[PDB]
Design an enzyme around this catalytic site. Structure first.
Site, PDB file in Angstrom:
ATOM      1  N   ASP A 172      -5.818   6.274  -6.080  1.00 45.03           N
ATOM      2  CA  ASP A 172      -5.274   4.949  -6.079  1.00 45.03           C
ATOM      3  C   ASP A 172      -5.043   4.403  -7.501  1.00 45.03           C
ATOM      4  O   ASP A 172      -5.173   5.102  -8.506  1.00 45.03           O
ATOM      5  CB  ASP A 172      -6.006   4.002  -5.133  1.00 45.03           C
ATOM      6  CG  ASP A 172      -7.379   3.609  -5.622  1.00 45.03           C
ATOM      7  OD1 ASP A 172      -8.115   2.861  -5.051  1.00 45.03           O
ATOM      8  OD2 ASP A 172      -7.645   4.043  -6.793  1.00 45.03           O
ATOM      9  N   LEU A 197      -8.901   4.276   1.515  1.00 43.89           N
ATOM     10  CA  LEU A 197      -9.771   4.880   0.573  1.00 43.89           C
ATOM     11  C   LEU A 197     -10.631   6.025   1.139  1.00 43.89           C
ATOM     12  O   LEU A 197     -11.258   5.998   2.199  1.00 43.89           O
ATOM     13  CB  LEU A 197     -10.601   3.936  -0.297  1.00 43.89           C
ATOM     14  CG  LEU A 197     -11.517   4.799  -1.199  1.00 43.89           C
ATOM     15  CD1 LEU A 197     -10.850   5.150  -2.516  1.00 43.89           C
ATOM     16  CD2 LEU A 197     -12.837   4.112  -1.416  1.00 43.89           C
ATOM     17  N   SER A 241     -11.672 -20.225  -5.771  1.00 45.66           N
ATOM     18  CA  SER A 241     -10.378 -20.110  -5.171  1.00 45.66           C
ATOM     19  C   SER A 241     -10.542 -20.359  -3.679  1.00 45.66           C
ATOM     20  O   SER A 241      -9.792 -21.108  -3.092  1.00 45.66           O
ATOM     21  CB  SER A 241      -9.976 -18.670  -5.396  1.00 45.66           C
ATOM     22  OG  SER A 241      -9.709 -18.559  -6.761  1.00 45.66           O
ATOM     23  N   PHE A 286      -8.607  -6.287   2.423  1.00 51.34           N
ATOM     24  CA  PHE A 286      -8.317  -4.864   2.603  1.00 51.34           C
ATOM     25  C   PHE A 286      -8.275  -4.147   1.229  1.00 51.34           C
ATOM     26  O   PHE A 286      -8.702  -3.016   1.040  1.00 51.34           O
ATOM     27  CB  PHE A 286      -6.890  -4.739   3.291  1.00 51.34           C
ATOM     28  CG  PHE A 286      -6.453  -3.339   3.700  1.00 51.34           C
ATOM     29  CD1 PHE A 286      -5.781  -2.504   2.788  1.00 51.34           C
ATOM     30  CD2 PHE A 286      -6.558  -2.942   5.041  1.00 51.34           C
ATOM     31  CE1 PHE A 286      -5.298  -1.256   3.212  1.00 51.34           C
ATOM     32  CE2 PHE A 286      -6.131  -1.679   5.465  1.00 51.34           C
ATOM     33  CZ  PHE A 286      -5.494  -0.843   4.541  1.00 51.34           C
ATOM     34  N   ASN A 310      -6.018 -20.521  -9.966  1.00 55.90           N
ATOM     35  CA  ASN A 310      -7.342 -19.997 -10.058  1.00 55.90           C
ATOM     36  C   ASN A 310      -7.346 -18.554  -9.681  1.00 55.90           C
ATOM     37  O   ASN A 310      -8.053 -17.724 -10.160  1.00 55.90           O
ATOM     38  CB  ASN A 310      -8.236 -20.702  -9.041  1.00 55.90           C
ATOM     39  CG  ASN A 310      -9.681 -20.448  -9.409  1.00 55.90           C
ATOM     40  OD1 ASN A 310     -10.364 -19.580  -8.894  1.00 55.90           O
ATOM     41  ND2 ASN A 310     -10.067 -21.003 -10.515  1.00 55.90           N
ATOM     42  N   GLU A 313       0.791  -1.192   0.000  1.00 50.48           N
ATOM     43  CA  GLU A 313       0.000   0.000   0.000  1.00 50.48           C
ATOM     44  C   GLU A 313       0.843   1.271   0.000  1.00 50.48           C
ATOM     45  O   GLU A 313       0.423   2.306  -0.515  1.00 50.48           O
ATOM     46  CB  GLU A 313      -0.819   0.044   1.264  1.00 50.48           C
ATOM     47  CG  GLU A 313      -2.142  -0.647   1.168  1.00 50.48           C
ATOM     48  CD  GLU A 313      -2.870  -0.821  -0.157  1.00 50.48           C
ATOM     49  OE1 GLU A 313      -3.500  -1.826  -0.377  1.00 50.48           O
ATOM     50  OE2 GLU A 313      -3.075   0.255  -0.869  1.00 50.48           O
TER      51      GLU A 313
END
Ligand SMILES: [Cl-]
Ligand SMILES: [Cl-]
Length: 162
Positions: free
Chosen positions: A20, A32, A117, A104, A132, A11
Site C-alpha cells: 500500500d 490489508l 474534528s 476503513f 481541522n 482504493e
C-alpha cells in the site's frame, strides 16, 4: 453513489498482492493483509483469508467478497465504538459515508483519535472541521484522497467523487 463505489474509487482494485501507500502488503480493494515485511507471511494471510492456496493472486469475485466483509466489519466496528457511534449517528447519509471511508483507511482507533474534528463534525461545523481535519498526517500523506473525504464532509455531497 455509495460507500462501496466511493471506496472502490479511493482504493482501486488489485488482483495481485501489492504494497500500500505505506508499504504494507495489501490485495483486492484495499484489503490489508499484513504489516509484516514478509511476503510469505502475506501469502499465508492471503490463503487463510481466501480459504485456498492462492499463490498471491485472487479472482475479482474473491476480491469483492473480501471487500464486502471489510465494509461490513468497518461499520460494525464504528457502531461498537463509543467515540465513533455518536458522531456517526449524528451524521447524514453522505457524510456517514465519509466517516466509514476514513475508518476503513485508517482503523477505528486511528479515526477515534481525531477528537477535535469529530467533535466539530458533531456540532455540524463543516468548514471548521475541514480545516481541522487537514492538519493531519493523513492529509499530508494522502492529500488527494484526504481532500475528497474532506470535501464530502464539508459539503454533504458526492461532488468530489464526480
Ligand atoms: Cl479476512
Ligand atoms: Cl492521495
Amino acid at each position: 453513489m455509495n460507500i462501496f463505489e466511493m471506496l472502490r474509487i479511493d482504493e482501486g482494485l488489485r488482483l495481485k498482492i501489492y504494497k500500500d501507500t505505506e508499504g504494507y502488503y495489501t490485495i483486492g480493494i484495499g484489503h490489508l493483509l499484513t504489516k509484516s515485511p514478509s511476503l510469505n507471511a502475506a501469502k499465508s494471510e492471503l490463503d487463510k483469508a481466501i480459504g485456498r492456496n492462492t499463490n498471491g493472486v485472487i479472482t475479482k469475485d474473491e476480491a469483492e467478497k473480501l471487500f464486502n466483509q471489510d465494509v461490513d466489519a468497518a461499520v460494525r466496528g464504528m457502531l461498537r465504538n463509543a467515540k465513533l457511534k455518536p458522531v456517526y449517528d449524528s451524521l447524514d447519509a453522505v457524510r456517514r459515508a465519509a466517516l466509514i471511508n476514513m475508518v476503513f483507511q485508517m482503523g477505528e482507533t486511528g479515526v477515534a483519535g481525531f477528537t477535535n474534528s469529530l467533535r466539530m463534525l458533531q456540532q455540524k461545523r463543516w468548514d471548521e472541521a475541514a480545516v481541522n481535519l487537514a492538519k493531519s498526517r493523513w492529509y499530508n500523506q494522502t492529500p488527494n484522497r484526504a481532500k475528497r473525504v474532506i470535501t464530502t464532509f464539508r459539503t454533504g455531497t458526492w461532488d468530489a467523487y464526480k
